[PDB]
Amino acid sequence: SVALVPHVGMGLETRTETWMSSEGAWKHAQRIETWILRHPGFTIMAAILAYTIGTTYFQRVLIFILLTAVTP
Amino acid sequence: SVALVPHVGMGLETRTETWMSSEGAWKHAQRIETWILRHPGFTIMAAILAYTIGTTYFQRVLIFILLTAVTP
Amino acid sequence: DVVVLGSQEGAMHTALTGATEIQMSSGNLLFTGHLKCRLRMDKLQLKGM
Amino acid sequence: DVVVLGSQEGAMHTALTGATEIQMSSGNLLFTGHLKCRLRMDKLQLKGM
Numbered sequence: 581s582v583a584l585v586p587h588v589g590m591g592l593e594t595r596t597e598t599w600m601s602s603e604g605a606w607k608h609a610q611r612i613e614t615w616i617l618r619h620p621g622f623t624i625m626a627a628i629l630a631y632t633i634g635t636t637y638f639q640r641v642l643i644f645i646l647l648t649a650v651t652p
Numbered sequence: 653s654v655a656l657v658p659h660v661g662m663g664l665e666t667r668t669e670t671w672m673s674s675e676g677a678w679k680h681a682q683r684i685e686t687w688i689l690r691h692p693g694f695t696i697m698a699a700i701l702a703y704t705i706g707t708t709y710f711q712r713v714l715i716f717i718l719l720t721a722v723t724p
Numbered sequence: 725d726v727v728v729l730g731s732q733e734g735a736m737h738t739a740l741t742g743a744t745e746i747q748m749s750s751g752n753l754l755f756t757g758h759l760k761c762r763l764r765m766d767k768l769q770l771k772g773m
Numbered sequence: 774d775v776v777v778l779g780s781q782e783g784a785m786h787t788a789l790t791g792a793t794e795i796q797m798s799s800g801n802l803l804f805t806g807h808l809k810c811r812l813r814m815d816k817l818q819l820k821g822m
Contacts (some may be wrong), residue, residue, distance in 0.1 A: 582784045583655035584683060585737050585778035589691075593803040597680045600788040615657060633714065634706045642705065646718045652656065652680065655787050660742035666756040671757050681760040735784030 615651055623648075687724055697718060 586604070600607070615622055625649035632639040658676070682711070688695055698719035702712040747753040796802040 581734065582781050582788040583735050584788075585687070586788045586790055588724075589754055590791060592793075594793050595807065596793060596805045598793045599786075604787075605791050611656060633720060634708070634711050636706060639706045639711070643718075646715070646721070648722055649718070649723075652658070652660070653783070653787055654732055656739075658742055662742065662771040664744075664746045666744045666758070668744060668756045670744045671737075676738075676741050705800050730786050731780045732782040732783035734779035734781040735787070737779050737796070 596645065604639060612648070622651075626650075666714070684720065684724055688720070694722075 588604075627644055629647065630644040634640065634643060660676075687708055702719070703717040706712065706715060744756050746755060793805050795804060
């Protein structure tokens with residue numbers, strides 16, 4: 581639901597801070613990294629995929645950080 | 653918050669349906685596609701990136717559907 | 725300033741999706757799950773012969 | 774069965790992040806934003822001479 585649409589990039593901003601104010605970003609990171617810690621295997625397999633496909637080293641890096649981003 | 657980590661892959665799933673059953677998936681899709689409609693430019697630039705990097709064709713497809721998966 | 729965050733109850737529903745629920749009123753109702761039993765039928769009559 | 778979904782109010786907060794809030798009690802309080810004015814000073818004494 582409203583759980584995701586969280587009106588971010590959008591526009592209009594302003595000179596004054598808005599709401600979660602230097603949190604929700606570091607929130608976003610901390611939670612996804614947490615979930616990484618919980619399910620290491622999926623990291624493993626994914627990384628393997630990175631070493632499989634493309635692999636053009638920089639490519640590997642990219643698609644890897646992707647497969648990190650992939651968890652909802 | 654609880655907005656994300658929605659206890660999904662996990663395990664233990666039973667014969668009987670659980671909760672949002674047969675919604676939250678098509679929710680997830682509809683959501684993100686909507687946001688795609690709203691911000692077409694980002695789709696454009698991203699796709700361009702796909703045509704830039706790697707690009708042995710299947711690669712392009714992959715890193716592109718990252719664009720889809722970028723962020724709601 | 726300090727702000728009460730506001731109830732997340734629904735959002736918590738949105739979280740607990742992807743999980744079988746359970747009704748619990750008195751002590752347990754528990755449904756779902758599964759079990760495996762092994763069956764020894766020896767002493768069974770045909771019910772009449 | 775049918776189920777009341779439960780309040781999303783907080784989750785709605787989590788959504789409205791990434792937005793400047795505004796207090797509104799009577800008619801408006803509106804803060805933030807910005808504006809552009811151009812200033813013609815002709816019309817000014819040094820305040821004592």
